[PDB]
Amino acid sequence: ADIQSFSFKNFSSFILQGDATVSSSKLRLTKVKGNGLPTLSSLGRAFYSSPIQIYDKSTGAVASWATSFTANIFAPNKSSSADGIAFALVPVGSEPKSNFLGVFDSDVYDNSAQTVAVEFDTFSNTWDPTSRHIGIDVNSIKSIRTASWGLANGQNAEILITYNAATSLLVASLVHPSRRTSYIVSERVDITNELPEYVSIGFSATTGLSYTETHDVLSWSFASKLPD
Amino acid sequence: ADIQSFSFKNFSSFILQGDATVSSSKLRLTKVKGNGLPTLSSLGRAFYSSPIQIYDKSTGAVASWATSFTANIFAPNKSSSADGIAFALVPVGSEPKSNFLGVFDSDVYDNSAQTVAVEFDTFSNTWDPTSRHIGIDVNSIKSIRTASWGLANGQNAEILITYNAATSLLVASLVHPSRRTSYIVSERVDITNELPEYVSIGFSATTGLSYTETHDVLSWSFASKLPDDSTTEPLDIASYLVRNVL
Ligand SMILES: [Ca+2]
Ligand SMILES: [Ca+2]
Ligand SMILES: [Mn+2]
Ligand SMILES: [Mn+2]
């Protein structure tokens, strides 16, 4: 049984791409002006330095894992929030994608993407459902299951994602303690077909073009357990 | 930092009350006939042998904790399901209560009860909301927040309860993998006012009088983390799970 875990409360163990930056001991994924306001046309991704193994081609074994983290998103003009943030598993060398939250290129299934992510969509792209949602994306910006999400502008969101290899079920939940609100989404996912043996875990967030908000991760914890 | 944790996949580390029984390496809380069918007018509670400390009067510190477990509930005649099952924190010597799921006596707040529980109500007692729900009970069978729950008769339910001392927020979620269904309920809870420094954790389940189902716990995991300074530090679920649950 191979185990890999970590816990950060204060964010060089990360690989940053684009506007991704850490300051104030907190990961800030999208751009922010001197005044401290967001930025239009931004994109940033942050990934853990050491790659983790999802499954083993030989043994056939598949790891069950879990991850949690807290994040605050502030969008002046709540109604002009965009585009959102996502937790993802991408192929190692992976260079950013479309600005789609920087992880996908189209709303059409493309196994070649070898990318799976949990999105926290704040702007509804008329593939997207009518309101802010939590979605499970498998090789396409078109989620395979979504859930209504009451966004608490400025407030923190404590989220928890888990993947049970036995049931092949992936589950996610955002929770705003400020308002005692809670949400979940579940969905089977054949991880062996959607991704590589080894992937990179992390975050990716974008902002609008014409519509922006902040994307700051506050704490991050992770653990994976691969059998023989 | 004082830590207490455990994990059971195969159920004498438990204190049983009433019809509570373990057989087939699985905790069976309500009665079952030879034929294997439920039983009317049943009640059973099961608790971990060692008591756990929720907070410290002196230090002022309050522990953040989490618990998970899998359970199957079968009720022939789905529409005649009753009464449900609950996870609870009760004062140590605690003898069972009303048959209310065996943990409360009235729908009126009574601090003297010093009991807090997460209910999985299957029969709607016209205090209860119209359909099966998940509720947070604080010293009363009248939940302080509830959530609609789609019951998968016979199928397993993987549940997870957590209490963040920093936010004083308590959260719960049942999940039926058979049907990829999920549910949550959240609610602030001033644990220091609702319970004793030391409590007993466990389960309690009842059945109807006139209406029954089975209440079998399959696996149980738990972890608590008490600090020294009033300063609270939520747990590591990311870890507590894979390591304990997955
Ligand atoms: Ca969108
Ligand atoms: Ca009831
Ligand atoms: Mn979407
Ligand atoms: Mn109720």
Domain boundaries, chain A: 1-228
- The one-letter amino acid code at B121 reads D
Query: Please, what is the Cα angle at B74 between B70 and B77, to 5 degrees?
Result: 155
What distance in Å separates the CA atoms of residue A106 and residue A125, rounded to the nearest whole number? 12
Strands (DSSP E) contained in chain A are 2-8, 14-18, 21-22, 27-28, 43-48, 52-53, 64-72, 84-91, 116-121, 133-138, 146-148, 156-164, 169-176, 181-188, 198-206, 216-226
Work out the minimum CA distance from B241 to partner chain A, whole angstroms: 7
Report the length, in residues, of chain A.
228
What are the Cα distances from residue B134, in Å, to A154, B19, B65?
Answer: 29, 23, 19
A with B: how many residue pairs have Cβ under 8 Å apart? 91
Do B246 and A7 make contact, defined as CB atoms within 8 angstroms?
no
User: Which of A182, A185, A223 is closest, CB to CB, to B243?
Assistant: A223
Q: Do A225 and B236 touch (CB under 8 A)?
A: no
Nearest to B148 by CA among B164, B168, B163, B128: B128
Q: Which of B173, B180, B241 sits opposite A187 (nearest CB)?
A: B180
> Which of A65, A68, A225 is nearest residue B237 as measured by Cβ atoms?
A68
CATH number of B1-246: 2.60.120.200
CB contact under 8 A, A186 and B186: no
Question: What residue type is A108 in one-letter code?
Answer: V
Considering only CB atoms, which chain B residues are within 8 Å of A183?
A: 184
A21 Rama sector, left if φ>0, alpha if ψ -120 to 50, beta otherwise: beta
Hey, are the CB atoms on A5 and B239 less than 8 Å from each other?
A: yes
Which of A5, A87, A49, A56 minimizes the C-alpha distance to A197? A56
Number of separate helices (H) and strands (E) present in chain A: 1, 16
3-state secondary structure of A80: helix
User: How many Å lie between the centroid of ligand 2 and the Cα of residue A27?
Assistant: 46
Distance (Å) of CA A63 to CA A155, A198, A202, B178, B242: 33, 11, 17, 20, 9
Q: How far is CA A141 from CA A20, A93, B10, B19, in A?
A: 21, 20, 42, 52
Q: Does B185 touch chain A (CB under 8 A)?
A: yes
State the virtual CA torsion across A150, A155, A158, A161 in degrees, nearest 10: 50
Method: X-ray
Q: How far does residue B76's CA lie from ligand 4's centre (Å)?
A: 21
- What DSSP line would sit under B181-196, residue for residue? EEEEEEEE--HHHHS-
Residue of A nearest to B167 (CA): A177
Q: How many angstroms is it from A101 CA to the middle of ligand 1?
A: 8
User: In chain A, positions 132-171, which contact chain B (CB-CB < 8 Å)?
Assistant: 145, 158, 160, 162-167, 169, 171
Distance A213 CA to ligand 4 centre (A): 40
* Contact across the interface for A164 and B246, Cβ inside 8 Å: yes
Share of chain B residues as helix, strand and coil, in percent rounded to the nearest 5: 10, 40, 50
Residue keyed to tokens 């789905």: B78
Q: How far apart are CA B78 and CA B240, in angstroms?
A: 34
- Of A227, A214, A199, A204, nearest to A93 (Cα)? A199
- 3-state SS, residue B55: strand
Which residues are paired to B191 by β-bridges? none
Cβ neighbourhood burial of A91 (10 Å; 0-12, 13-18, 19+): middle
Contacts of B109 (CB under 8 A, 6+ apart): B138, B139, B140
Question: At B113, phi and psi to the nearest 5?
Answer: -65, -35
Q: Which amino acid is at B118?
A: V
The whole-angstrom distance between residue A184's C-alpha and the CA centroid of its chain comes to 15
Strands B52-53, B2-8: pairing is unpaired
Tell whether B241 lies on the interface with A, counting CB pairs under 8 A.
yes
Closest CA to A117 of A4, A216, A199, A221: A199
Rounded to whole angstroms, the Cα distance separating A3 from A110 reads 30
Backbone angles phi, psi at A140, to 5 degrees: 180, 145
CA distance B93 to B200: 8
Domain A1-228 classification at class level? mainly beta
A61 touches chain B (CB under 8 A): no
Preceding omega of A19 cis (within 30 degrees of 0): no
**Alpha carbon distance A125, A81 (integer Å):** 12
Closest residue to A183, CB basis, from B145, B184, B243:
B184
Rounded Cα distance, A184 and A172, in Å: 5
* Deposited resolution, Å: 3.3
CA distance A147 to chain B (A): 11
Q: How far is B44 from chain A (nearest CA, A)?
A: 30
- Across the interface, whether the CB atoms of A184 and B171 are under 8 A apart is answered no
